[PDB]
């Protein structure tokens, strides 16, 4: 179990650590988060009390270094940093733990929610989507645009998701225009899986990361990317059976974890109705269709 210590909490802020959220009051004696499960990526994100505008945060993996958060009063945010001096960090963390100034990552032992949402998410791939190579952790916020969004303006602060576009020469073989537009299996399996992603695990990992970015930060372009990657599978007549089984699990936990209050903004009616009711795979997502229909029948 690992720890993300905090230098101090100088401004009132709601702090998130994966699907859990807690309030820290201005200058409350808070010094970080402990007992964080090893083996998973994690995200710590913040929404300032004063400005609910710009939820921001940091993807990270405790195995990749010792990370701490300190408020920057010039830039006005909680910044993640890496402590190179391992001994100083152990000493700082032990002092905070003895004085019990840290919240405990509150995992119930029956609960596989986080694993299920992050199964295929790897820090190495996150860092290729979020380009900031000097840091082992990755910053995301609400306003960051995607590479495709900049094709339709600051390239360094972008989310470099894989571009998917159903009406593109990449997606449509000359002389198979109708075949490939109505059955995207060529684009899914040859262009994307075999060509770009190499395997379904990388595909699913980007898909899961897009969802989490959308659900946690209200990152609109991430939301678009998550929906595009679902649609690309649902609109393919030919999909490996294990990919559909796994997709149904993935989406199931995303829909289950989804807070109810943001369901209208995070769920695209057209995509979901198409995927569940019109697409080749309309009969292949039993778990996802069941939860969707019992929790958000309004959308359908």
């Amino acid at each position: 179990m690992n720890t993300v210590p905090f230098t101090s909490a100088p401004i009132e802020v709601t702090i998130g650590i994966d699907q859990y959220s807690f309030n820290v009051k201005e200058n409350q004696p808070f010094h970080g988060i402990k007992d964080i499960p090893i083996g998973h990526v994690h995200v710590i994100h913040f929404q300032h009390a004063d400005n609910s505008s710009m939820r921001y945060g940091y993807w990270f993996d405790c195995r990749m270094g010792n990370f701490y958060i300190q408020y920057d009063p010039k830039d006005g945010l909680y910044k993640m940093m890496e402590e190179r001096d391992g001994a100083k960090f152990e000493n700082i963390v032990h002092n905070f733990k003895e004085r019990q100034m840290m919240v405990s990552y509150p995992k119930i032992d029956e609960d596989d929610t986080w694993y299920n949402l992050t199964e295929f998410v790897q820090m190495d791939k996150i860092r290729k989507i979020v380009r900031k190579d000097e840091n082992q952790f990755s910053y995301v916020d609400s306003s960051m645009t995607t590479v495709q969004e900049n094709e339709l303006s600051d390239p360094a602060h972008s989310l470099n998701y894989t571009v998917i576009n159903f009406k593109s020469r990449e997606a449509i073989r000359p002389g198979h225009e109708m075949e490939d537009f109505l059955d995207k299996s060529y684009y899914l399996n040859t262009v994307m899986l075999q060509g770009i992603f190499k395997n379904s695990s990388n595909y699913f990992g980007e898909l899961q990361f897009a969802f989490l970015n959308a659900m946690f930060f209200g990152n609109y372009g991430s939301s678009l990317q998550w929906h595009a990657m679902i649609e690309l599978i649902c609109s393919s007549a030919t999909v490996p059976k294990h990919m559909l089984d796994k997709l149904d699990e993935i989406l199931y936990y995303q829909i289950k974890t989804l807070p109810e209050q943001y369901s209208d903004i995070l769920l695209n009616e057209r995509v979901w109705n198409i995927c569940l009711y019109s697409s080749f795979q309309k009969n292949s997502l039993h778990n996802t269709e069941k939860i969707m229909e019992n929790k958000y029948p309004e959308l359908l």
Partner: protein, 237 residues
């Protein structure tokens, strides 16, 4: 974006544009089978592709053989339309390629856009006009070449005959749409109007009769009447 009454003069500027109407591409007769079931029999069709400025009509005849062994023919017809329009554009010299293609039905947008991905500078556009181009097969000489075709075939026409020698393309299009609307609302009356007088002939190289300016006004008035009429007979007014 879409084309409507606000921007009707755009049709007659100097940017090359084509209208594409696919309503006569897939045509069937529905009939009973010996077992009392119902079946379709396809008949020859055509893509109606028309330059509204010049009057040039690229009439691509769809021979029934193109449906042999195919499924979901109403859907295939849209993609077949797009494929053949895409082929036409590619055959034209660059300076003759359209800058815009306007489709008369919104269901043609995606099929055409996909086929023309190679031409990203060509705008594919819908329209809110209810244009009467489906009545093209009420023009006897167009109907004749479609029904006689034994193979796929492109036939070129000028749907304005020689009108542009005397009137503008705005007026030529308005005449054409009036004639086609009339034929669509009541073909027999429309055709009676056009051919009642035996002394006004259709030249071998034309589609419509050789009316003088004065005769065209009478004709135009008679077709307006027909369309207001049938609109009564329809709505009892």
């Amino acid at each position: 974006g879409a084309m409507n009454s606000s921007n009707y003069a755009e049709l007659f500027n100097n940017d090359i544009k084509l209208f594409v109407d696919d309503t006569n591409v897939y045509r069937v007769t529905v009939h009973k089978t010996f077992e009392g079931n119902v079946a379709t029999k396809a008949i020859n069709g055509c893509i109606f592709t028309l330059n509204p400025k010049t009057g040039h009509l690229f009439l691509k005849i769809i021979h029934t053989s193109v449906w042999a062994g195919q499924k979901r023919l109403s859907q295939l017809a849209k993609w077949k339309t797009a494929e053949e329009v895409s082929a036409l554009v590619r055959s034209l010299p660059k300076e003759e390629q359209p800058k815009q293609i306007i489709v008369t039905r919104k269901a043609m947008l995606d099929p055409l856009e996909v086929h023309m991905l190679d031409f990203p500078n060509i705008a594919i556009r819908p329209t809110e006009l209810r244009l009467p181009f489906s009545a093209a097969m009420s023009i006897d000489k167009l109907s004749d070449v479609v029904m006689k075709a034994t193979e796929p075939q492109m036939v070129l026409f000028n749907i304005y005959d020689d009108w542009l020698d005397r009137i503008s393309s705005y007026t030529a299009f308005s005449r054409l749409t009036l004639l086609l609307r009339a034929l669509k609302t009541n073909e027999e009356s429309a055709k009676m109007i056009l051919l009642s007088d035996p002394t006004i002939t259709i030249k071998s190289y034309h589609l419509w009769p050789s009316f003088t300016d004065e005769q065209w006004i009478t004709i135009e008035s008679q077709m307006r009447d027909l369309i207001l009429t049938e609109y009564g007979r329809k709505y009892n007014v």
